[PDB]
Design a protein around this ligand. Structure first.
Ligand SMILES: [Mg+2]
Ligand SMILES: [Mg+2]
Ligand SMILES: [Mg+2]
Ligand SMILES: [Mg+2]
Ligand SMILES: [Mg+2]
Ligand SMILES: [Mg+2]
Ligand SMILES: [Mg+2]
Ligand SMILES: [Mg+2]
Ligand SMILES: [Mg+2]
Ligand SMILES: [Mg+2]
Ligand SMILES: [Mg+2]
Ligand SMILES: [Mg+2]
Ligand SMILES: [Mg+2]
Ligand SMILES: [Mg+2]
Ligand SMILES: [Mg+2]
Ligand SMILES: [Mg+2]
Ligand SMILES: [Mg+2]
Ligand SMILES: [Mg+2]
Ligand SMILES: [Mg+2]
Ligand SMILES: [Mg+2]
Ligand SMILES: [Mg+2]
Ligand SMILES: [Mg+2]
Ligand SMILES: [Mg+2]
Ligand SMILES: [Mg+2]
Ligand SMILES: [Mg+2]
Ligand SMILES: [Mg+2]
Ligand SMILES: [Mg+2]
Ligand SMILES: [Mg+2]
Ligand SMILES: [Mg+2]
Ligand SMILES: [Mg+2]
Ligand SMILES: [Mg+2]
Ligand SMILES: [Mg+2]
Ligand SMILES: [Mg+2]
Ligand SMILES: [Mg+2]
Ligand SMILES: [Mg+2]
Ligand SMILES: [Mg+2]
Ligand SMILES: [Mg+2]
Ligand SMILES: [Mg+2]
Ligand SMILES: [Mg+2]
Ligand SMILES: [Mg+2]
Ligand SMILES: [Mg+2]
Ligand SMILES: [Mg+2]
Lengths: 71, 59
RNA sequence: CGCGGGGUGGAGCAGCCUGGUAGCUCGUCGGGCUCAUAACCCGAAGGUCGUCGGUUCAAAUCCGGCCCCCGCAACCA
RNA sequence: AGGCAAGGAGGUAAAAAUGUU
RNA sequence: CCGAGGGUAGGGCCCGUGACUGGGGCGAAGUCGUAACAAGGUAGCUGUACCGGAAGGUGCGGCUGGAUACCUCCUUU
RNA sequence: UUCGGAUUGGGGUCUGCAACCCGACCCCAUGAAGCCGGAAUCGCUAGUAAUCGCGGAUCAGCCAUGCCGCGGUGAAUACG
RNA sequence: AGCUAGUUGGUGGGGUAAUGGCCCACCAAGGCGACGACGGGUAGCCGGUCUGAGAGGAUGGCCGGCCACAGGGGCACUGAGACACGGGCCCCACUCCUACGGGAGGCAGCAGUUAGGAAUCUUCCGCAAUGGGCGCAAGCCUGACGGAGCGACGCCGCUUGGAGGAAGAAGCCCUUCGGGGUGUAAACUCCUGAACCCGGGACGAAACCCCCGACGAGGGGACUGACGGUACCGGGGUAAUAGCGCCGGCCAACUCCGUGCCAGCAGCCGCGGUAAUACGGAGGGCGCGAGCGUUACCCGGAUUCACUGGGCGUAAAGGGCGUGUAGGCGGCCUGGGGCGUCCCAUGUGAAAGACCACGGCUCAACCGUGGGGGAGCGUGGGAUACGCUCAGGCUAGACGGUGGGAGAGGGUGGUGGAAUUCCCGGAGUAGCGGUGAAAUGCGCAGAUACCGGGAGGAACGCCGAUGGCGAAGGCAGCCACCUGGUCCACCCGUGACGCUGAGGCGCGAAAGCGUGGGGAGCAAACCGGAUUAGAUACCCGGGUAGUCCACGCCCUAAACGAUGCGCGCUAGGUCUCUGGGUCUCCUGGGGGCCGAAGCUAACGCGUUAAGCGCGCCGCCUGGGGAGUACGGCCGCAAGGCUGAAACUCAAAGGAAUUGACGGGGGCCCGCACAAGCGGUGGAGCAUGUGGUUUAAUUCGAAGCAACGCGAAGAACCUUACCAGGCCUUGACAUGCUAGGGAACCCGGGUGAAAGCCUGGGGUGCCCCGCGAGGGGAGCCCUAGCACAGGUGCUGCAUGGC
């Protein structure tokens, strides 16, 4: 089925954490745990604090996200 | 919770069947789709007894 | 403008006090060194040594005028 | 005196940090 | 009289919670540093002592699960 | 400086439709810097380095002092 | 880790059906305990059941036995028998009624309600059978029981058809577009006839009862079914439920789309970040089948707690060693006993189950009959090889004597020089010290260096070792004293005295702590300097504790041979120390090295085993958590010993190998440095580039291996860049629709050219026709098209080079 409820909202990176997990403050409002894309990791695209990435968000829990796009 | 997208919420009644999941830390327990407020996965058609999904009624 | 301690390569400072010696530190240009950025390490300039004339055998170095600069007197009124 | 050495000697510089693909 | 049990002090265990506090496992791109692994750039490890953000560091002693030869000069074959 | 040739002015000559940007070349004048070059650093062990000139290709012409090729003169020093 | 005060024994008495600390009075002072008492937890126990090759391991559902309890607790009474489930009294708790004084209850009986919970049944019929109780008996009870009901809850049995029937229908999927699969599956034809109806329809039930017979034995008779109008049999009679898991490896079975480290799957390995054999679907397949999976729990596999059957040098693991108690274990001979041990006989090991046979229910399940076995335990008889035990003996073990020896063994008492440092004397002058460099530092108050004397404290150079000693930690000046161990010769003496060793006692580097001394050097902490992005470090200079001793404590360790001790056996050689010999070579006792057999994961080990054995002890059972916690003991404290789990991870680990690397080593090379000649960097210019500028300064080349390079020829061309003007199937290719004109040149205007507009010479070919005229080829133009074109982007998509 792939539930396409996936919330494609932008956020500027507040903070860096390990394993490429990042508190990113959103255009939407909150700062929530959002970890990297696999794609980005593969491509070695270094997320650094102060960047407008696209944090994909689950409707089950927005408090965790997933970074999609390169800054 | 397995499946493809839970109907579950916050104060709904659920069933555990146990069993470790390797990736996830400290989780030793599968919620089992079918019974209670853990309703089944819509449009499973193959592996569905593991998932509380009753038959696709045929014509 | 009183007072009195100074302006040092370009920047911050030593040497001023026992007078002959300009030093360090930072930077700029070459070069090394690397995969490089180095750091580094080499060198290359660059000081009216705030100045003026005075001393001496010799002056940043010693007395002064200054241009000052920082000041602090310029307060009790 | 050489042959092969045995044994004690004091030198073999001191650094050295980083990694966008 | 014996006597279940009750009461009153005192402990014991055990459950519940419990302000307070210790607090460990893992984690690709956390932060500081680079300890260790090559003599890892001061051999390391070690037991203990004190100290330090921290890895640790030093001291005393032990160990080898440690690496190591190449020139010159004196005594002697 | 009769070393040394930059730069510039003037006149030309040739090739090409055309040399101003942007050619080569000739002539005459001009005659700058430079007195063997810091720390560095490259080349080379034999007809070699060094020096000296010629030819070629591309090409109308040539900015070629390049590249490729050829020959002439002809070293030094290698302990290690 | 100690427990016990009726607690252990006794006299008397009570009590009991009966013994007894069951209880009481009194005396005695035991009794138990590491061969695990007491305490805490867990738990009804067994026959069994499951598993398992077995030994075991788990478990104790139902059915059988025993036990214990009937809300919790306590007590008696009656009785053959209870400490009495549907009996009593009392208290407590709870529910119920109350005219508040009080009474009544007990489903852990069936059944059911409720609660808890993942989860568990009918408020069933019947006394017919069996049993039970009462009764002369009739009979009466009987939720014991017999049955039915519910649940795929389990096991077994069957049905969802069978036969035919395409080189192969469709539907659906794949495709290499040929084809293949689904699949003889279907449809269809033939036959059966689960279901369902009609007909009959029970065994189980012959006793107890009556009468003959004595109310006996024996004989005749009759009544008596919940199941159930079920089982079944006869006749008829319809093709009439298929599902679930999986499909990467283990592990049986593969493809397509969807998805693209997301959604997801997972039991582990792990799969997924664009054709996923692993995710979602589809088909296809495989496994089972009225089931199939999942989860829990248990065994197995797991020889992963190891008796059969693991180990301990490095992997987890040898205790730090000594002595030593319990315990375990014990040389040779000769006999007695006969406990262990073995055998036979027999008793017991209930039934059910397990096992084998046969029988019955249409099979099987299930049940029956028969049989055997069965570990263990008793009893009687024996056996004496071994173990035990008692006796006698023996010298191979062990211990001892005599003769010696090596020795840093340990303590006590002294003493010897070298050195340092400190003081004084001398003489001396300008620095010394220090480092990769320097600085702090000390020194003209005269240091550093040098002599002379003294003060003291510490350690002991050379011998010195791969050496010796010790049980180990450890131990070195020298002397003496006391004193431990040890080793050999002689085999003289004892006659198994032995080996180990839980505990226990004893020792125990170094640091550390206490009291007091001592204090030269060194030297944590500390202060300095430097070094450094920082320096709490290396380095240097001071410096307190401490190092040193005495007493006392601490007791750890890479307390290492990372190897417990003991004894026996099993090729050597070689050096080494130390003893005796008949002394170039034998024979003992140590220390090393290399190696037979063998062992081991390899490394290695290898008469000094890690080999073959045996004895005994100490540990180990994934890592991390963690030597931590909690408790306990010790300690003046520091901390030690003892020693977990929760959790968490599919590793942690060893050994070797290939590499790779090393601010590791050696050998070797090169114009790589040296040796030499000449340059370059400096001057100008010639050029290429980096930058900046520009409308654009074409794009690329990047340390060597980019830079007189691609550019081996940029005025235009080149030319890819920019301004302007213009063109469009287009400069070029192979076609189409076609429409006219069409081979072709000669011009004119505009314009920087390109181009645009435009005139006019100008059609022959193949041809058919007398001619008018018509078509097609070559060839060219216009409109749309197939298409061109792109030095346009990707050399981490590439080929070539
Ligand atoms: Mg979305
Ligand atoms: Mg180190
Ligand atoms: Mg009595
Ligand atoms: Mg209890
Ligand atoms: Mg229990
Ligand atoms: Mg029973
Ligand atoms: Mg009761
Ligand atoms: Mg009850
Ligand atoms: Mg009685
Ligand atoms: Mg009763
Ligand atoms: Mg419930
Ligand atoms: Mg009834
Ligand atoms: Mg009656
Ligand atoms: Mg009744
Ligand atoms: Mg029954
Ligand atoms: Mg699945
Ligand atoms: Mg799978
Ligand atoms: Mg699948
Ligand atoms: Mg064993
Ligand atoms: Mg093993
Ligand atoms: Mg180990
Ligand atoms: Mg003994
Ligand atoms: Mg014996
Ligand atoms: Mg039996
Ligand atoms: Mg003196
Ligand atoms: Mg020894
Ligand atoms: Mg004798
Ligand atoms: Mg004798
Ligand atoms: Mg004897
Ligand atoms: Mg002390
Ligand atoms: Mg004290
Ligand atoms: Mg000192
Ligand atoms: Mg310091
Ligand atoms: Mg020091
Ligand atoms: Mg030792
Ligand atoms: Mg021992
Ligand atoms: Mg061998
Ligand atoms: Mg060996
Ligand atoms: Mg072994
Ligand atoms: Mg410890
Ligand atoms: Mg403790
Ligand atoms: Mg290794």
């Amino acid at each position: 089925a792939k539930e396409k409820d996936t919330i494609r909202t932008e956020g500027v990176v507040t903070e860096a954490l390990p394993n490429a997990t990042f508190r990113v403050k959103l255009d939407s409002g909150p700062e929530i745990l959002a970890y990297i894309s696999g794609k980005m990791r593969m491509h070695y695209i270094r997320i650094l604090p102060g960047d407008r990435v696209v944090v994909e968000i689950t409707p089950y829990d927005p408090t965790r996200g997933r970074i999609v796009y390169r800054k | 919770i397995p499946g493809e997208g839970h109907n579950l919420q916050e104060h709904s009644v659920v069933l555990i069947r146990g069993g470790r999941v390797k990736d996830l830390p400290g989780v030793r327990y599968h919620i089992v789709r079918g019974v209670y407020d853990a309703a089944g996965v819509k449009d499973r058609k193959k592996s569905r007894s593991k998932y509380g999904t009753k038959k696709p009624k045929e014509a």
